[PDB]
Design a protein around this nucleic acid. Structure first.
Ligand code: MG
Ligand code: MG
Ligand code: MG
Ligand code: MG
Ligand code: MG
Ligand code: MG
Ligand code: MG
Ligand code: MG
Ligand code: MG
Ligand code: MG
Ligand code: MG
Ligand code: MG
Ligand code: MG
Ligand code: MG
Ligand code: MG
Ligand code: MG
Ligand code: MG
Ligand code: MG
Ligand code: MG
Ligand code: MG
Ligand code: MG
Ligand code: MG
Ligand code: MG
Ligand code: MG
Ligand code: MG
Ligand code: MG
Ligand code: MG
Ligand code: MG
Ligand code: MG
Ligand code: MG
Ligand code: MG
Ligand code: MG
Ligand code: MG
Ligand code: MG
Ligand code: MG
Ligand code: MG
Ligand code: MG
Ligand code: MG
Ligand code: MG
Ligand code: MG
Ligand code: MG
Ligand code: MG
Ligand code: MG
Ligand code: MG
Ligand code: MG
Ligand code: MG
Ligand code: MG
Ligand code: MG
Ligand code: MG
Ligand code: MG
Lengths: 129, 87
RNA sequence: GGGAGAAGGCACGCUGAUAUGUAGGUGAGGUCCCUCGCGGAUGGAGCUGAAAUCAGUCGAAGAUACCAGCUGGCUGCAACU
RNA sequence: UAGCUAGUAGGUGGGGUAACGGCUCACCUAGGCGACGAUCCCUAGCUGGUCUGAGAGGAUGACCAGCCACACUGGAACUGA
RNA sequence: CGUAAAGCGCACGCAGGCGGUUUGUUAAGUCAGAUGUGAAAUCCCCGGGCUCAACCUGGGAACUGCAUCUGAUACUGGCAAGCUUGAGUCUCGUAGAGGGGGGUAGAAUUCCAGGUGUAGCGGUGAAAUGCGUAGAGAUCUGGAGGAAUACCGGUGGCGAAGGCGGCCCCCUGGACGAAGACUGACGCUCAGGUGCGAAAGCGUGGGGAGCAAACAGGAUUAGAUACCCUGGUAGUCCACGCCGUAAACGAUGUCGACUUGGAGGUUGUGCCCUUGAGGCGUGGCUUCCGGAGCUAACGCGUUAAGUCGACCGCCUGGGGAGUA
RNA sequence: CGCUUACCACUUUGUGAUUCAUGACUGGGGUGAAGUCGUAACAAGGUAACCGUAGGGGAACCUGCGGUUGGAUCACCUCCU
RNA sequence: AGGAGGUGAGGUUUU
C-alpha cells in the first residue's frame, strides 16, 4: 500500500527524467507543494502547479539541459521504517556543496545551506544532486 | 444471499434503507450469511473451497466490529446485543 | 489409565486456653399469619460433637496392647482376571 | 533453559534498624515477575580507560585513578562515631 | 536470496512493524538556547622545563551522554472535527474441468453362459515361458461388475496453492463488466498460532474390470537379484481418520506507485448508417518477441530480474549433515 | 554465672536432574598405495536424468505412483491441402 | 510452403 507519498513523488520525477518526460502529474499534498517550492527555487525543476479543489493534482515541469536531464541523483534519506533526525552541527553536504539536502526545520522546509545559516536542524527528507 | 433478505436487513439496520454500506449493515449481512452456511457446512464437511469464503467473511466481520468498537462503543454494544454475538 | 501406598521423611499421649464444649449437626418453649395442622418464616433454649493452634506436663519408648505392606534393581515366560 | 514464585505481591496491626522498607512477626486478600526473554546453565570483578581501525565499529580492562568483594575454608557476634 | 548458499508448499490471522488527505490544539520524539553534571589522570591544540627526545607540566577544546528550564511547530506520534482518491457494501448481468453431495448415458477392457467354426493364439531384434484338439484364438447374442469419460480440447478456463475434464439436479465460494447509491482509512505485512495441502504410505469396513511395486518363470548377458516377455499380490477405487512430505518451480515472498512498444488469445462493456463476419474506444486475466534500464553472463524486460516505500522468511566455503 | 527455648554452621541419610572421564561391542563418516567386484552418473552415458515416497536387492542401484526440465534433435518416406 | 502416420545394434565392460 502507499506509505511514502514523498518517495512516490521523487520516483515519479526520476522516472520522468529517465524517460525524457516534459511533465509529471501526481496527487497533491501540503508537503509535496513545499518540496516543489524548494526544487523550483534551486532550479532543479521549471515550474509546479496544482489543479482542483477536492482531489488536487500537482503537476511538475521537468528541466532538460543539453538534451540530458538535470537531476542525476535523488534519494529518500528518511523513510517510515527509519526516521533520520540530525542537528545543525552535523548537517550533511551533498556533493561537497553541489547538491541539496532538503531539511524540514521548525520554521518550514529549506535546504541545508539555508538551515545552517538559521542555526536550526530537523528532519532530512531527501538528497538531490 | 437473497435480495429480499438483504433489503430487509438494510431496512432494519440502516437509516434511509438505501445506504447499504454501513458497518452495522455489513456486519448483519455477514452474520446472516454465516448463520445460513452453518447448516451447509454441517453436512458438507469436505468443502474447504467454500469454507475459505466463510473464514474471509468472519475476518471482515471481526475487523468491522473492531473498528466500530474503537469508534463508537454505544453502537457496537447494541449491535452485538441485537445479533446475539459475544465479542 | 499407570508405575505409586513408589523410594524416603515429619506430627501422633495427657491437661488448660482459644471455645466455663469451637466449626458443624439435631433441635424445644415462646413469636406471625395460615388453606388452619403429622404445616411454614422467625428463634435459639437444651443435647451431641469433630478437627486445628498455642502453652505446659510424664515416661527410654504416646500408630505404646491385639490387629496391622519389607523395599529396590536386572532378567526369561505368560498379555492381564 | 518456556514456565517461575507461598514471606512469594500487597494490605492492617505490633516488633526492629541511625533511617524508609516483609527487614521480621500475627491476620486478611491471590496476587507478582516473564516473549521488551522471568527461571536455569556456563564464563566473567566494573568504570575512567588501552590496542586496532580514518570513521561508525571489533577486542580488552595488566601498570595510573575511582567503585565493589575477600583475607586458610564455612558461618557468628562484641567493643567501637 | 531465477541459475554459486539463500523466498517458508500455500493461505487466514493475534501481538508487533508501517500507514491516504484537511483543519485546530496539545508539544511526547524531534529542533534552538541556557543551567547543573559528565572526577582527576589519558587523546588532541597552543606553549613551557629536564643539554633534544622519550618524560613531566600550564591553559583550552573534547568527553558524541544525562536531568531540568525557557521556547519554535515544518515531520511522526497523542486528541477532536472532517474528505473520498485506498479499502469495503448494495442494485443489474457475464463466463468458468471452482468445491461438496446425489443420480444417469455411451464407447471400451475383463469374466461368465451359450451359437458358427478349426490349429494355432499371443509375444520378441530374433526366441521362449505362457494360452490351446478338455475345442483356444477368431465372429454373434445375452448377462455380471469395476474404473475413467475418445472428438470438441486450444502455451484455452477456474482456484491462495496443491490441483480440477461425459451429462443432469441441490447447496455453496470467488472473480470480472457498464451505470448508479452509501461508511469515511475501517488500510498492508506478519514471529508464534491456525487451516488447507500432489502422489506414495498406515488403521478400520467394503469393493476390486484394467494396470502394476514386491514375487515366480522364460529370454539377453561372462554374470543380470535390471532393461524385454509371460502371469500376478499389496496398491490403484469408495467412507471415516492419520502422516504433512515433492524438481510443492515462474528454481523469482506479499501489497502498493511510476517508466518507450509490437503481435495475439480469452472474457465484458460504450458508441458509429451493425447498414453481412465492419471501424473506434474502455476494463480484467493470459502467451510470445523485443527498447531504455538491470544483470557475472544466460537472460528479465509494464505480469520485471527496471525506478522506490512497508513487512515477513532465509543464506555467510565445500564435506561432515539437514546427520548425531 | 548455670539450664532451657528460637535462629544457624561443620556433618549425615534417601531419591533425582546436569556435566565430565572411561567402557566389551557396534552403526555411520573422513584420510590413505594406482587393493578386490560391478560400471550407477557426465553424450540420448548406451533402460533420459532428478526430487518425494514404498518395496526389493552384495554394492553402486532397480521397479511401482505423482511431479519437475536443471534432456538430445529425432529427418526422411507416404497421404491430404 | 501448412497439417497427419510411423521410423534408429536388442544388449556388449575397464584402462
Ligand atoms: Mg498381606
Ligand atoms: Mg533379551
Ligand atoms: Mg537365561
Ligand atoms: Mg498367566
Ligand atoms: Mg507374546
Ligand atoms: Mg506470614
Ligand atoms: Mg511501628
Ligand atoms: Mg510495619
Ligand atoms: Mg572470577
Ligand atoms: Mg575498515
Ligand atoms: Mg567488558
Ligand atoms: Mg594462600
Ligand atoms: Mg572467615
Ligand atoms: Mg555498638
Ligand atoms: Mg546446484
Ligand atoms: Mg540455488
Ligand atoms: Mg514460493
Ligand atoms: Mg499521516
Ligand atoms: Mg518535546
Ligand atoms: Mg537540547
Ligand atoms: Mg622545549
Ligand atoms: Mg575527564
Ligand atoms: Mg498531526
Ligand atoms: Mg500507530
Ligand atoms: Mg464444476
Ligand atoms: Mg455464484
Ligand atoms: Mg508461520
Ligand atoms: Mg493415496
Ligand atoms: Mg488402505
Ligand atoms: Mg512386468
Ligand atoms: Mg528372477
Ligand atoms: Mg521442503
Ligand atoms: Mg510448472
Ligand atoms: Mg524452494
Ligand atoms: Mg497475508
Ligand atoms: Mg508490482
Ligand atoms: Mg488465473
Ligand atoms: Mg523478452
Ligand atoms: Mg540478479
Ligand atoms: Mg561449513
Ligand atoms: Mg532428521
Ligand atoms: Mg539410472
Ligand atoms: Mg552408465
Ligand atoms: Mg541412463
Ligand atoms: Mg546397460
Ligand atoms: Mg542424461
Ligand atoms: Mg508397507
Ligand atoms: Mg525388481
Ligand atoms: Mg506442480
Ligand atoms: Mg575393474
Amino acid at each position: 500500500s502507499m506509505q511514502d507519498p514523498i518517495a512516490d513523488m521523487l520516483t515519479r520525477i526520476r522516472n520522468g527524467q529517465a524517460a525524457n518526460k516534459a511533465a509529471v502529474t501526481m496527487p497533491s499534498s501540503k508537503l509535496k507543494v513545499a518540496i516543489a517550492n524548494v526544487l523550483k527555487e534551486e532550479g532543479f525543476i521549471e515550474d509546479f502547479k496544482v489543479e482542483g479543489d477536492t482531489k488536487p493534482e500537482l503537476e511538475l515541469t521537468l528541466k532538460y539541459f543539453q538534451g540530458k536531464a538535470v537531476v542525476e541523483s535523488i534519494q529518500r534519506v528518511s523513510r517510515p521504517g527509519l526516521r533520520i533526525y540530525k542537528r545543525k552541527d552535523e548537517l550533511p553536504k551533498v556533493m561537497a556543496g553541489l547538491g541539496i539536502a532538503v531539511v524540514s526545520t521548525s520554521k518550514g522546509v529549506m535546504t541545508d545551506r539555508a538551515a545552517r545559516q538559521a542555526g536550526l536542524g530537523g528532519e532530512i527528507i531527501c538528497y538531490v544532486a | 444471499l437473497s435480495t429480499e433478505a438483504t433489503a430487509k436487513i438494510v431496512s432494519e439496520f440502516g437509516r434511509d434503507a438505501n445506504d447499504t454500506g454501513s458497518t452495522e449493515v455489513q456486519v448483519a449481512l455477514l452474520t446472516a450469511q454465516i448463520n445460513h452456511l452453518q447448516g451447509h457446512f454441517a453436512e458438507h464437511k469436505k468443502d474447504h473451497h467454500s469454507r475459505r469464503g466463510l473464514l474471509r467473511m468472519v475476518s471482515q466481520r471481526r475487523k468491522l466490529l473492531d473498528y466500530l468498537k474503537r469508534k463508537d462503543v454505544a453502537r457496537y454494544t447494541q449491535l452485538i446485543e441485537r445479533l446475539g454475538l459475544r465479542r
